[PDB]
Design a protein around this nucleic acid. Structure first.
Ligand SMILES: Nc1nc2c(ncn2[C@H]2C[C@H](O)[C@@H](COP(=O)(O)OP(=O)(O)OP(=O)(O)O)O2)c(=O)[nH]1
Ligand SMILES: [Mg+2]
Ligand SMILES: [Mg+2]
Ligand SMILES: [Mg+2]
Length: 539
DNA sequence: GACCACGGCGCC
DNA sequence: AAACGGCGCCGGGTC
């Protein structure tokens, strides 16, 4: 390309090199831009950010986030990763996309600008005639990238002192457990080593092996195995308690306080827009989509996620979302009616399965009923369903056959979906997001059947993801104008921050936007709550 | 130090 | 584990 002085004209494709992948923590090492046969390299990349009107190119969102960190309003625009990811969601990395669509991801910003420009040209070509994908790009993914840049740059407030204090208390309770385990073993070992634990449980204590591990065929020590073994020996209960505590401490209590950003005083995740096979977002560095919520200690952790002083969190979560989506996709008259009538399938299952009235169903029971309801739907075995309730291969199954014959268009929807996927090589969401599933004609039954469950799950999980993305795009500007913030997405949930005085109004508005995003054959209901912390805002 | 593959497990 | 799906982060062998 012809070498040309910095600054580029309007509409050029940017290339940029970061010291590390996380845009909130990165040093911008280099910046360049490409357009009309010319490449322009920035002498001083931070100053040079100020000359751009938008970030247009590979990983546009990440540069935008870095710009926002520096007080610049540089929105992301076209990004070939989003075009590629819509063509085939196994397109997840710039190395891969480049190789597939016409160049090489190098460590030079100029080359990255040039690559961005030519990959955009090519990928735009490939989306010719692909009207549903183009709609997804223009109406969902491209505008969503700007929303995600703001969310990443804004961050969430964390009660650091609370977590530090909690760490010290949890350390003591862990020592009590590990000491008991070692006493019961008759010797110490590394309790964090599942290989050492395997030897102790099954060789030294002679407990029965239940299951084997997937890749290397060891005797499993997983929670399902230990649960089965609870009454065999008192060590097993102590191992389960130890695992619960150490998981929480090593994954959340300890690391999160050290990730507070020195200039914002907040915690900044990354929302990865080209990372899943179904069209969901992911969250990393750290992951804020798997913050604990279920156990007593997990609830304590979730309490550390708090609002700015004088603000409240507003948590909004779609009710029974994949079930509603499935009603629409299958057009099943019975399931449509269940929702027309305001029923709750999770609560009904929980009530039935624990034998208590609906008013006695607690959050733990509701979570177990979800496992049941989504499990059966997405192809859980009669064998595992036996054990989950868990009662027997008698009335563990039969249950599947009734579940399905109640909703006869579901079976037909699955079979239509699978037969389409075999012929086409892909399945799709309501909006035409695609997932290629080639193993549908595999000849190893276990491989083929795994593929099938992947394949029919995707239109449901993926349509739910499309809806949430669209809600985000519609909701974001409404929040800006109200002086509220969008903080987190958790698949079917949004966490917002609002000034106390406006929090109620924000909650109503956000709820209505999410409920009316794209009407289906059943209502979408959203549960909304407000509080000083993320837990109180869902309670 | 960082890489991976694994088992394991947190959330949706 | 058990053949529900989708993720990302934690703590033996290698380089
Ligand atoms: N296949 C599968 N999908 C799940 C599972 N747990 C959650 N999901 C998917 C389906 C849910 O509809 C969606 C959102 O999770 P939620 O915990 O909000 O559940 P849901 O919206 O169904 O119920 P809610 O009324 O919000 O409690 O994520 C699971 O165990 N298996
Ligand atoms: Mg929900
Ligand atoms: Mg949810
Ligand atoms: Mg893994």
């Amino acid at each position: 390309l012809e070498e040309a002085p910095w600054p580029p004209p309007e509409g050029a494709f940017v290339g940029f090199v970061l010291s590390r992948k996380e845009p909130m923590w990165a040093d911008l090492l280099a910046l360049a831009a490409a357009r009309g046969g010319r490449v322009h390299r920035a002498p001083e990349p931070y100053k040079a950010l100020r000359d751009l009107k938008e970030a247009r190119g590979l990983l546009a969102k990440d540069l935008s986030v870095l710009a926002l960190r520096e007080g610049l309003g540089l929105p992301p625009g076209d990004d070939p990763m989003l075009l590629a990811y819509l063509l085939d969601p196994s397109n997840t990395t710039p190395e891969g996309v480049a190789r597939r669509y016409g160049g090489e991801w190098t460590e030079e910003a100029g080359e990255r600008a040039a690559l961005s420009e030519r990959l955009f040209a090519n990928l735009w070509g490939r989306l010719e005639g692909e009207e549903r994908l183009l709609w997804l790009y223009r109406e969902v993914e491209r505008p969503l990238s700007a929303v995600l840049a703001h969310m990443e740059a804004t961050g969430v407030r964390l009660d650091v002192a609370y977590l530090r204090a909690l760490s010290l208390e949890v350390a003591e309770e862990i020592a009590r457990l590990e000491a008991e385990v070692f006493r019961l073993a008759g010797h110490p070992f590394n309790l964090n080593s599942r290989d050492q634990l395997e030897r102790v449980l099954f060789d030294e204590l002679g407990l029965p092996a239940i299951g084997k591990t997937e890749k290397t065929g060891k005797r499993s020590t997983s929670a399902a195995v230990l649960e089965a073994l609870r009454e065999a020996h008192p060590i097993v209960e102590k191992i389960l308690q130890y695992r619960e505590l150490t998981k929480l401490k090593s994954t959340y209590i300890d690391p999160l306080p050290d990730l507070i950003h020195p200039r914002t005083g907040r915690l900044h995740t990354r929302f990865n827009q080209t990372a899943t096979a179904t069209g969901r977002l992911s969250s990393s560095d750290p992951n804020l989509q798997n913050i604990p919520v279920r156990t007593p200690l997990g609830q304590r952790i979730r309490r550390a996620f708090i609002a700015e002083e004088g603000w409240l969190l507003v948590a909004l979560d779609y009710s029974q979302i994949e079930l509603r989506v499935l009603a629409h996709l299958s057009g099943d008259e019975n399931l449509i009616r269940v929702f027309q009538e305001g029923r709750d399938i999770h609560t009904e299952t929980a009530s039935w399965m624990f034998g208590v009235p609906r008013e006695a169903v607690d959050p733990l029971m509701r979570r177990a009923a979800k496992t049941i309801n989504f499990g059966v739907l997405y192809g859980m075995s009669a064998h595992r369903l036996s054990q989950e309730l868990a009662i027997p291969y008698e009335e563990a199954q039969a249950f599947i056959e009734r579940y399905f014959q109640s909703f006869p268009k579901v079976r037909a929807w699955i079979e239509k979906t699978l037969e389409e996927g075999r012929r086409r090589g892909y399945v799709e969401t309501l909006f035409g997001r695609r997932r290629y599933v080639p193993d549908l004609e595999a000849r190893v039954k276990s491989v083929r059947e795994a593929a099938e469950r992947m394949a029919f799950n995707m239109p449901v999980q993926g349509t739910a993801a499309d809806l949430m993305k669209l809600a985000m795009v519609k909701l974001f500007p409404r929040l800006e104008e109200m002086g509220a913030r969008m903080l987190l997405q958790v698949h079917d949930e949004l966490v917002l921050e609002a000034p106390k005085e406006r929090a109620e109004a924000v909650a109503r508005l956000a709820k209505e936007v999410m409920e009316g995003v794209y009407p289906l054959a059943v209502p979408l209901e959203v549960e909304v709550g407000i509080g000083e912390d993320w837990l109180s805002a869902k309670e």
